[PDB]
Amino acid sequence: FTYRGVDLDQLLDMSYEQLMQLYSARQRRRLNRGLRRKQHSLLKRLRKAKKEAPPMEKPEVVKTHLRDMIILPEMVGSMVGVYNGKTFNQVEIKPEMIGHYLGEFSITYKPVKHGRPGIG
Amino acid sequence: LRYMSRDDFRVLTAVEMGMKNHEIVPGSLIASIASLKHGGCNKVLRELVKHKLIAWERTKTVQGYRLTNAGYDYLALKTLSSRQVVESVGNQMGVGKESDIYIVANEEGQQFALKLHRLGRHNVSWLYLSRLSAMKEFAYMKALYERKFPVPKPIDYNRHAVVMELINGYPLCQIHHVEDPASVYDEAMELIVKLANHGLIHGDFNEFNLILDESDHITMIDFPQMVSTSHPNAEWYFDRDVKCIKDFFMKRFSYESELFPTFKDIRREDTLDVESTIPPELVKQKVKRQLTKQQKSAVRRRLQKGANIFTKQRRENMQNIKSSL
């Protein structure tokens, strides 16, 4: 995999600043806005399961209510249910989706299959 | 929905009896023509006003009740339930301007289509004009189905309701593409000649009165506008419908016609433009009919005294006057 001409090798060892200049338009806003006291606490709990995993295991699924969080490249491979409103889902963090948000993989609605039109 | 299934039939039919002769029907008359239960129909009327079944009128001297739009509709479905055609309600409803399309289901579970005429002069005339519309539409629907035409199958008619065969598709006005434009075109051109052969001109044979079934079969609906071929301008309405289809397929699907049908064939088919001597058992029957009529006339006068509303208004003011003295 390669994102913006940068391989997965370099993405992990870079600075926090230097990842911005690769990001999209909306994404460079937020890291200069700053990740908050709850969102500093969600990147720390993901460092635990990956390290306490068996090294042939991608880590256990750790629940959360932060849909809006971007995928940082140190989040790659972290099994995280992202909440829809009702009950959690399973989202494999691939390195291909770092530019996106976690919210879009927790699908909010069940898509509509129409039953017959009633008395209209 | 329909939970109540006894007194509601008799009271609402009694409104329809008064509606045919007079405008707003007084509550005094209702109980006399609904003689099966006496006195307790006035609380049924108070349950009828909870729904959109009847409307109250207390103008100046005119005191009573008139039948509503939806109240007239429930009466037909109550009759269709007894004829074992309608049981439950399907939800796909095409709310139109002249009529409403309601999907109905029988005892079998087989889904049919129901038409309810909504013509909208007082509401009394409006709920009589819808009566003549259904009887006229069902007449053509029977006339064409018997004569090989691709129309919905007529089942039953009740006052303003028409039960038809469920042909489900999309109207021709909202169609993007047809896989075979030429075969569909020739099918439609045949149907104008078919009607002219039976001595009929559609008049308004447009893309707004045609439905495609799986883009294979053209279905025709809406028949109150139809004219005879004996009309002086018979070929004008014939040619206007031809040009309407000729240009539409050239406009929407870009198909130009190779065949130009202008044949006048009247009539090779059925002309559908027209569309001690007395035995003791008889003595018993006749004496019975006399005795029933004497009792029925006396029961009318007992029910005419129900005025209960007039007595209630008079009592309220007298209490106010005595307290103030």
Swiss-Prot record, chain A:
Keywords (A to Z) from UniProt: Acetylation, Cytoplasm, Isopeptide bond, Ribonucleoprotein, Ribosomal protein, Ubl conjugation
MF annotations from Gene Ontology: DNA binding; MDM2/MDM4 family protein binding; RNA binding; structural constituent of ribosome; ubiquitin ligase inhibitor activity
Localization per Swiss-Prot or TrEMBL: Cytoplasm
Keyword Cell inner membrane: no
Biological processes, Gene Ontology terms: cytoplasmic translation; liver regeneration; osteoblast differentiation; positive regulation of signal transduction by p53 class mediator; ribosomal small subunit assembly; ribosomal small subunit biogenesis; ribosomal small subunit export from nucleus; rRNA processing
Subunit structure as annotated in this protein's UniProt entry: Component of the small ribosomal subunit.
Family (UniProt): Belongs to the universal ribosomal protein uS19 family.
Entry function: Component of the small ribosomal subunit. The ribosome is a large ribonucleoprotein complex responsible for the synthesis of proteins in the cell.
Protein name per its UniProtKB record: Small ribosomal subunit protein uS19
Protein's organism: Homo sapiens
Residues of the full protein shown: 15 to 134 of 145
UniProtKB/Swiss-Prot annotation, chain B:
Modifications the protein undergoes after translation, according to the UniProt entry: Autophosphorylated (in vitro).
EC number annotated for this UniProt entry: 2.7.11.1
Binding site for ATP: 115
A Pfam family it matches: Rio2_N
Required co-factors: Mg(2+)
One GO CC term on file: nucleoplasm
Cell compartments where the protein resides: Cytoplasm
Substrates-to-products reaction catalysed: L-seryl-[protein] + ATP = O-phospho-L-seryl-[protein] + ADP + H(+); L-threonyl-[protein] + ATP = O-phospho-L-threonyl-[protein] + ADP + H(+)
Keywords from the UniProt entry: ATP-binding, Cell cycle, Cytoplasm, Kinase, Magnesium, Metal-binding, Nucleotide-binding, Phosphoprotein, Ribosome biogenesis, Serine/threonine-protein kinase, Transferase
Family membership: Belongs to the protein kinase superfamily. RIO-type Ser/Thr kinase family.
Biological role: Serine/threonine-protein kinase involved in the final steps of cytoplasmic maturation of the 40S ribosomal subunit. Involved in export of the 40S pre-ribosome particles (pre-40S) from the nucleus to the cytoplasm. Its kinase activity is required for the release of NOB1, PNO1 and LTV1 from the late pre-40S and the processing of 18S-E pre-rRNA to the mature 18S rRNA. Regulates the timing of the metaphase-anaphase transition during mitotic progression, and its phosphorylation, most likely by PLK1, regulates this function.
Protein name in UniProt: Serine/threonine-protein kinase RIO2
Organism: Homo sapiens (Human)
Lineage of producing organism: Eukaryota, Metazoa, Chordata, Craniata, Vertebrata
Gene: RIOK2
